[PDB]
Amino acid sequence: NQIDLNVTCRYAGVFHVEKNGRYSISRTEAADLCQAFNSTLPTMDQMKLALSKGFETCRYGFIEGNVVIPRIHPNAICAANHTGVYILVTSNTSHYDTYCFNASAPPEEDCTSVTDLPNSFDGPVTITIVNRDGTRYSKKGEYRTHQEDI
Ligand SMILES: CN1CCc2c(N)cccc2C1
């Protein structure tokens, strides 16, 4: 009963979250997840400003209304060499990573570690935030409000 959440640097409040190191988050879980970080799913505009501040990944994730990959540098194996906020158009499947937006985060690049999940609720899951530099923060709780997600 254990969930790893891989989190990135924030860029204008926008960060990426990977559950258990694979595409495994539903749209409804993604909203629940961001709310656990006192965050929301980014708008396209929030995501575009994050991009301009240095934000890029090589992973599909939910924002509000779409599934995207922010790209700065052209790479053939990430969004097929596109740049800008690349929008997934055609896919059979519904599970991806998520982006979240924290409005209290610094305005530009914040590559400090994430040390809490301030809005998780009571629950029996060991939830571990895993930072890129390997730093870990763990707590017992839960964040999923939809039964079909558990
Ligand atoms: C594949 N991902 C890439 C990103 C990432 C982060 N941001 C934190 C922990 C692990 C990982 C591994």
Short mmCIF file of C-alpha atoms and ligand atoms in Angstrom, two decimals:
data_model
loop_
_atom_site.label_atom_id
_atom_site.label_comp_id
_atom_site.label_asym_id
_atom_site.label_seq_id
_atom_site.Cartn_x
_atom_site.Cartn_y
_atom_site.Cartn_z
CA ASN A 1 0.00 0.00 0.00
CA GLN A 2 2.58 2.48 -1.25
CA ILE A 3 2.60 5.26 -3.89
CA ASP A 4 5.73 6.97 -5.23
CA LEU A 5 5.20 10.46 -6.70
CA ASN A 6 8.11 11.74 -8.82
CA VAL A 7 8.11 15.57 -8.78
CA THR A 8 10.15 18.12 -10.80
CA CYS A 9 11.32 21.73 -10.32
CA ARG A 10 8.52 24.30 -10.48
CA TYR A 11 8.53 26.85 -13.29
CA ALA A 12 6.21 29.76 -12.66
CA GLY A 13 4.37 27.47 -10.25
CA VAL A 14 4.07 24.62 -12.83
CA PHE A 15 5.59 21.17 -12.15
CA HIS A 16 5.32 17.61 -13.46
CA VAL A 17 4.22 14.55 -11.40
CA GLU A 18 4.78 10.90 -12.34
CA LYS A 19 3.00 8.22 -10.29
CA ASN A 20 5.10 5.06 -9.67
CA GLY A 21 7.36 5.93 -12.59
CA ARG A 22 4.88 5.06 -15.32
CA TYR A 23 1.84 6.51 -17.11
CA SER A 24 -0.79 5.57 -14.56
CA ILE A 25 -2.88 8.62 -13.67
CA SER A 26 -6.48 9.17 -14.81
CA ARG A 27 -7.95 12.62 -15.45
CA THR A 28 -9.92 12.43 -12.23
CA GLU A 29 -6.91 11.24 -10.17
CA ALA A 30 -4.78 14.02 -11.67
CA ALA A 31 -7.18 16.68 -10.32
CA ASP A 32 -7.17 14.94 -6.93
CA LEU A 33 -3.37 14.76 -6.98
CA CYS A 34 -2.85 18.45 -7.72
CA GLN A 35 -5.34 19.36 -4.97
CA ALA A 36 -3.22 17.25 -2.58
CA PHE A 37 -0.36 19.65 -3.37
CA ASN A 38 -2.73 22.66 -2.86
CA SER A 39 -2.41 22.97 -6.64
CA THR A 40 -4.66 22.90 -9.70
CA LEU A 41 -4.24 21.52 -13.21
CA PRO A 42 -2.48 24.23 -15.27
CA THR A 43 -4.27 26.23 -17.94
CA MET A 44 -2.57 26.32 -21.36
CA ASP A 45 -1.48 29.89 -20.57
CA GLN A 46 0.07 28.89 -17.20
CA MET A 47 1.83 26.06 -19.04
CA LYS A 48 3.07 28.49 -21.75
CA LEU A 49 4.62 30.84 -19.17
CA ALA A 50 6.22 27.86 -17.37
CA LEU A 51 7.75 26.84 -20.74
CA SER A 52 9.18 30.33 -21.27
CA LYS A 53 10.87 30.14 -17.83
CA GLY A 54 12.74 26.94 -18.72
CA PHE A 55 10.18 24.12 -18.29
CA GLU A 56 10.46 21.03 -20.47
CA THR A 57 9.81 17.29 -20.02
CA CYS A 58 9.68 14.18 -22.22
CA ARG A 59 6.38 12.94 -20.77
CA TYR A 60 2.66 13.23 -21.55
CA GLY A 61 0.65 14.81 -18.75
CA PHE A 62 -2.74 16.40 -18.09
CA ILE A 63 -3.30 20.13 -17.98
CA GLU A 64 -6.84 21.65 -17.90
CA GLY A 65 -8.50 20.37 -21.12
CA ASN A 66 -5.55 18.62 -22.80
CA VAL A 67 -2.65 16.24 -22.48
CA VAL A 68 0.66 17.84 -23.38
CA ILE A 69 4.45 17.84 -23.34
CA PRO A 70 6.26 21.17 -22.91
CA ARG A 71 9.32 21.24 -25.20
CA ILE A 72 12.20 23.70 -25.43
CA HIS A 73 14.91 21.74 -27.27
CA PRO A 74 14.00 19.61 -30.32
CA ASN A 75 14.50 15.92 -29.58
CA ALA A 76 13.36 13.15 -31.90
CA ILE A 77 12.08 10.87 -29.12
CA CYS A 78 10.15 13.60 -27.23
CA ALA A 79 6.96 14.82 -28.91
CA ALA A 80 8.46 13.93 -32.32
CA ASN A 81 10.90 16.86 -32.49
CA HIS A 82 8.37 19.63 -31.76
CA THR A 83 8.99 22.73 -29.59
CA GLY A 84 6.48 24.79 -27.57
CA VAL A 85 3.63 23.19 -25.65
CA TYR A 86 2.96 20.07 -27.72
CA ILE A 87 -0.64 18.85 -27.57
CA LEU A 88 -1.43 15.11 -27.79
CA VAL A 89 -4.03 14.73 -30.55
CA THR A 90 -4.62 11.00 -31.21
CA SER A 91 -4.37 8.25 -28.55
CA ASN A 92 -6.41 5.11 -27.60
CA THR A 93 -5.62 5.36 -23.91
CA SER A 94 -6.51 7.50 -20.95
CA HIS A 95 -3.72 7.21 -18.39
CA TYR A 96 -0.81 9.67 -18.35
CA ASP A 97 1.24 11.72 -15.88
CA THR A 98 -0.06 15.11 -14.65
CA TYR A 99 1.16 18.68 -14.43
CA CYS A 100 0.09 20.77 -11.42
CA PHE A 101 0.21 24.50 -10.80
CA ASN A 102 1.00 25.97 -7.38
CA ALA A 103 0.21 29.69 -7.31
CA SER A 104 2.32 30.30 -4.16
CA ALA A 105 5.51 28.93 -5.78
CA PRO A 106 8.22 31.41 -6.94
CA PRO A 107 7.65 33.29 -10.25
CA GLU A 108 10.48 31.63 -12.20
CA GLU A 109 12.61 28.45 -11.80
CA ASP A 110 12.30 26.83 -8.38
CA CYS A 111 14.50 23.72 -8.36
CA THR A 112 14.38 23.20 -4.62
CA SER A 113 12.98 19.90 -3.28
CA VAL A 114 9.33 19.31 -2.43
CA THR A 115 9.01 18.40 1.27
CA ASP A 116 5.25 18.00 1.87
CA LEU A 117 1.91 17.05 0.37
CA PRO A 118 0.21 19.69 2.47
CA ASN A 119 -3.37 18.81 1.58
CA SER A 120 -3.39 15.00 1.62
CA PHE A 121 -6.16 13.59 3.83
CA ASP A 122 -6.44 10.67 6.33
CA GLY A 123 -5.84 7.27 4.70
CA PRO A 124 -3.76 4.08 4.89
CA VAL A 125 -1.36 4.69 1.95
CA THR A 126 2.34 5.34 2.42
CA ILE A 127 2.83 8.27 -0.01
CA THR A 128 6.40 9.13 -0.94
CA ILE A 129 7.39 12.32 -2.77
CA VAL A 130 10.51 11.53 -4.76
CA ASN A 131 12.63 14.50 -5.95
CA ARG A 132 15.02 14.37 -8.91
CA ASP A 133 18.03 14.66 -6.57
CA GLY A 134 16.73 11.57 -4.73
CA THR A 135 15.41 13.38 -1.63
CA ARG A 136 12.33 11.75 -0.12
CA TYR A 137 9.43 12.88 2.02
CA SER A 138 6.91 10.30 3.21
CA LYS A 139 3.51 10.40 4.88
CA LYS A 140 0.58 8.11 5.56
CA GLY A 141 -2.56 9.41 3.89
CA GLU A 142 -4.72 9.36 0.77
CA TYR A 143 -5.61 11.82 -2.01
CA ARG A 144 -8.00 9.86 -4.28
CA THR A 145 -11.68 10.78 -3.90
CA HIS A 146 -13.01 8.61 -6.76
CA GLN A 147 -13.52 4.88 -6.10
CA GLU A 148 -12.77 3.86 -9.73
CA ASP A 149 -9.27 5.31 -9.17
CA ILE A 150 -8.29 3.05 -6.23
C1 LIG B 1 11.64 9.33 -15.27
N1 LIG B 1 11.49 10.35 -14.24
C2 LIG B 1 11.94 11.65 -14.74
C3 LIG B 1 11.63 12.77 -13.72
C4 LIG B 1 11.79 12.34 -12.39
C5 LIG B 1 11.63 13.28 -11.36
N2 LIG B 1 11.33 14.53 -11.73
C6 LIG B 1 11.77 12.94 -10.01
C7 LIG B 1 12.08 11.61 -9.68
C8 LIG B 1 12.24 10.66 -10.69
C9 LIG B 1 12.10 11.01 -12.04
C10 LIG B 1 12.26 10.01 -13.03
#
